[model samples]
Target: SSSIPMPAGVNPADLAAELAAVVTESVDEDYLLYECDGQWVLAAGVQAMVELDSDELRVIRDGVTRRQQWSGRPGAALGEAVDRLLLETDQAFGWVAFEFGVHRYGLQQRLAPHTPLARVFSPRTRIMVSEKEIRLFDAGIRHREAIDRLLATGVREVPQSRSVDVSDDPSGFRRRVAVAVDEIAAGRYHKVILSRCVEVPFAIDFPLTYRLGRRHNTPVRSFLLQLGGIRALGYSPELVTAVRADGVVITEPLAGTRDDLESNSKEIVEHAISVRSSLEEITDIAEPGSAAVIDFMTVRHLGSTIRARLDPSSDRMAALEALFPAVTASGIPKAAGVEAIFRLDECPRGLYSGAVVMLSADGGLDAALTLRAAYQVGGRTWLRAGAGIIEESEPEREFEETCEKLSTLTPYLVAR
Candidate 1:
């Protein structure tokens, strides 16, 4: 074990911040900082790149093509493939695009050609930080002194940049919501989650922004990543699945957004429907008599939290398959909701409603739904948010709900 006592006075978050600062300023290497509970893992320098596309699974190591295999059912296939990949490596970290679920939902036709559903890398350097100590894995030992220097230097003040007021056309978003409401009323789908995107004019400082934004939101999980041509940081309000090595799985669904939850029939119905959908989905993958809604309809912040537990006979991938996108992010009936989203939304959801996942070598997995997040691709940076459109949903109110959700990140953006 290359573990050492954490440097005096440096917290896990500070270590993560310092590592992020190092990546942002010192090198071209990709990095990911994931915070779960109080521990943090800052991974950098890819030793192996595993990518899952529509037609193939590819693993590239040391600038050489190492392996390629035909794949199907993206969730399960990825799990199996990654499992095999980790057999030779220590651990991996990366993202699963929302489009990945299209394969499982039978909506492959909706996917853009050559869309990469998931990409995770086995990093050369992995530093696992906790309250008391840091464990270095693989190339992490080589990076120890550098991190120590960073800890001593502390995080520098990130220059505050002006916010870009991305103009909004509420009419367009409202028009789409209206159409969705009409469709729901016509029984096209019970509920559909529709989203709109607003482009930011400047490149974002992912490290600085994530550090700042994380201070404001109490998310179930938070992650900052710059990999695979996508830069995203999010305060995930809910989880798709958290599976342990023993097969116990837990999922939290957050729905029914508003300031108050008392006596609001519409909000109550919306919350109930979302919870029921989750209950049903959990039941599908769960072993007999293992599924139950442990927590129900508890209000938290803008949404209510409904927690469910089950024991799946399979591994994390099966749990992921059963709930790729959380029901709160998707709609009542996921397939129908996705159809409406494709029909009405302005662009591909990409990773917006997807998941930012972290897989361990111990047969455990945790996936946080990619919502309340900011995304930057190439030169363009944008924020996207969605609202669940029920038949009783007013177009204007739904649009406002999206605005409310977007506010979670917009105020915390740091420009470059």
Candidate 2:
């Protein structure tokens, strides 16, 4: 059960302000501010945390096991936003093992596992929109106290610190692109997307930067999340996948960019071939998922949106993981593509190509590709971008395309 002890008329924006005030740790990506169906939501703090280092399907199942035990219920459901790095970690796959409070229309309430639920790890929790009346449920003993504290906490704004600007090594990056294109010409892999990191040897306000990006980019998924020492602000233009409680799922894979990015570009064709392979595995448990291109991205790219009805008995987590190592961030023959990325590129992709997903308490999932994203670790904040290379991709054109991709976040970084 939940109640609002705050003075009458406080709205969701105000609620978000309060949550932001309390979550001040730059290293902690747990703080969140997101909107859905015209409703604003917030979830914060840690009940427990999970970290994984291996690319394993079992990691998700194990998290479920510990989650049920933590809740002291035989079938208690938990929510999370999983990262793509979780799937590829050689160490145990990592997770921030905490569940946040929330509600929805038609509240049947068994708790969802795959919806957007997050907050910077902090106190003074609040979430809502249009200043709706507050109604909470199943809060147990913490409900009353939570309401009291939320009401008593004074509102404040989170502070911001700007970082210095950084630049990229165009020649080195272009050379790498040339090499990858040569490799593709040799038929080593159908397509290889290579990326680089532009490092800022400084610290800036992450929350503020995220807000800046949110306003600047017309993305399918935008978020600021921190897990297991990694902090990311991702503005993705394509929907990797979205799952519903009824077992329906949607995937939109966006590839290729700018003029002639899709039609004449061999990279786009090669990109679709790998994306199709991953779709094959997920749809295998049933009939295959269907897809459609949105013509062109709001930016200059092109994408295919896929839809499917999943069978409940099949492992959706595994299906989503299989989509990787080829789809979104990786390329064909999985290993060959990843190997090329490691060998040809000067730096690891980190959070750039990874995902920032929120698993609803009811098992609903919405995941966005970690494209056009930034990763801040240590003192440096690195933003990355890439162009898919093929036999015909001109070295200069490929390098310019990556700069175009980086354009989304560069202005903000330079300003900060």
- Can you write out model 1's per-residue Cα lDDT over 291-346, one digit (the tens) per residue? 77777776663243333344545667777877766667667688888767778886
Shift of residue 251 alpha carbon in model 2, Å: 1.1
**Candidate 2 stretches greater than 4 Å from native:** 1-18, 25-29, 32-40, 55-167, 259-275, 287-300, 346-348, 414-416
C-alpha displacement of 49 in model 2, angstroms?
1.0
Q: For model 1, what is the alpha-carbon lDDT of residue 347?
A: 46
lDDT of 2: 0.50
Assess every candidate by TM-score: 0.92, 0.67
